[PDB]
């Protein structure tokens, strides 16, 4: 089954993040309200988007460390689908963020934009998670780290574990390729979609190129 | 002496004003707590030390990625200190740090959930100044206490040049735990603004650091 693809809006506020979802919405599966916009207008863009938008998943990428049960519920009162808990975070914030959400008939992804270990990959499908996103850090991207090997090898065996991955962190057009072969559940475009010349036309090319590589 | 932190673990400005208008005046240290980041944005911070510019005003982000982005936009809003979550990658500490600078504020790596002494060292040698040792929130609730483990880390952290704050679900009976070392601060959340007295509950937490320190 075709990767999906997800707009990250990473804006600052509400009015700059409608500017590109005006565009994309239907062009895309999955609308994220990223981490820099729930900082900067809090979870009134979760509210505010889902009923834009509320035949999309939206995704609340609060990226939760601790607090789980109250965090977690303050983003699915507000509509959220999905939420992100850091993979740092002790497990019980895990876990208390994925009871929520099975309250409210969402779910939970764990974040992978730090250090962790494969003992913590297991606890979280014990925990009944099944969903991370591998993550190239922003700010290691800009001091030079590319995609490689490393990342193609545990991606597969997060695939392996019965993980659905997502695959963020700076993607272009050109690293696609890259993943061929490997059941991506999700890609997610920030910059390569909203900052493009034609915001549309940048999210049907992805969208072709996974129809090609993964069809 | 140890300074007093009060966190505003409020969902909306409104509560968090229930606590500020009793005890804003008895602490050193106003937090804007992550869930009120989550519930109001960066207003949270802007409104807060305009209220209260003469307090240090912390905003609780825990960032974890795009350092230089979400602290920028902190600072900007007038935060003095920001938190960057311990898994963050090291060039996220950096970017934010490098931010702080600029607006002659500071950095917290927060120590919440998993780290290593590796990246311990890795924030010393990035000119990171200050740490939270922070007893997580979900892990006392799953019955995890402090304990000898948790001052020998402390100690650790402090002798390798950190300044360290001491947090999760502190008491005013929890002080004497920490006695000789030199804590730089000590937050209260929930024993401050769900005590029946917040004022005597903060006046007590200082006479207690008085005693102590
Ligand atoms: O969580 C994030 C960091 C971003 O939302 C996501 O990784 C994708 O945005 P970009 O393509 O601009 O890196
Ligand atoms: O980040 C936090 C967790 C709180 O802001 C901090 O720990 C103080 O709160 P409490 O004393 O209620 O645990
Ligand atoms: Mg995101
Ligand atoms: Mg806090």
New interface residues.
């Given amino acids: 089954s075709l990767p999906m693809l997800q707009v990250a809006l ?1 804006n ?1 506020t509400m009015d700059s993040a409608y500017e590109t979802t005006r565009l994309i919405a239907e062009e895309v599966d999955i609308i994220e309200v990223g ?2 916009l ?7 863009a979760v509210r505010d988007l889902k009923a834009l938008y509320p035949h999309k998943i939206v995704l609340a990428d ?2 939760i ?7 977690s519920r ?2 699915f009162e507000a509509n959220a689908d999905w939420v992100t808990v ?5 497990i ?2 895990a876990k ?1 963020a994925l009871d929520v959400a099975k309250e409210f008939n969402g779910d939970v992804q764990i ?1 992978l ?5 494969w003992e ?1 990959a297991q606890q979280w499908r014990d925990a009944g998670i099944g969903q991370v996103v591998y ?1 190239r ?4 991207q ?2 030079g780290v590319a995609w490689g090997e490393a990342d193609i090898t545990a991606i597969k065996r997060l695939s392996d574990m019965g993980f659905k991955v997502t695959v963020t962190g700076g993607l272009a057009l050109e690293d696609l390729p890259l993943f061929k072969g490997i059941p991506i559940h999700v890609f997610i475009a920030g910059r390569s979609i909203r900052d493009a010349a034609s915001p549309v036309e940048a999210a049907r090319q992805f969208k072709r190129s996974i129809a090609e590589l993964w069809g």
């Fill in positions: 990473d600052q981490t820099i729930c900082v900067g207008e809090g979870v009134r609060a990226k460390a601790d607090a789980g049960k109250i965090l303050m983003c850091i993979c740092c975070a002790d019980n914030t208390g974040e934009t730090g250090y962790w270990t913590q993550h850090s922003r700010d290691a800009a001091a």
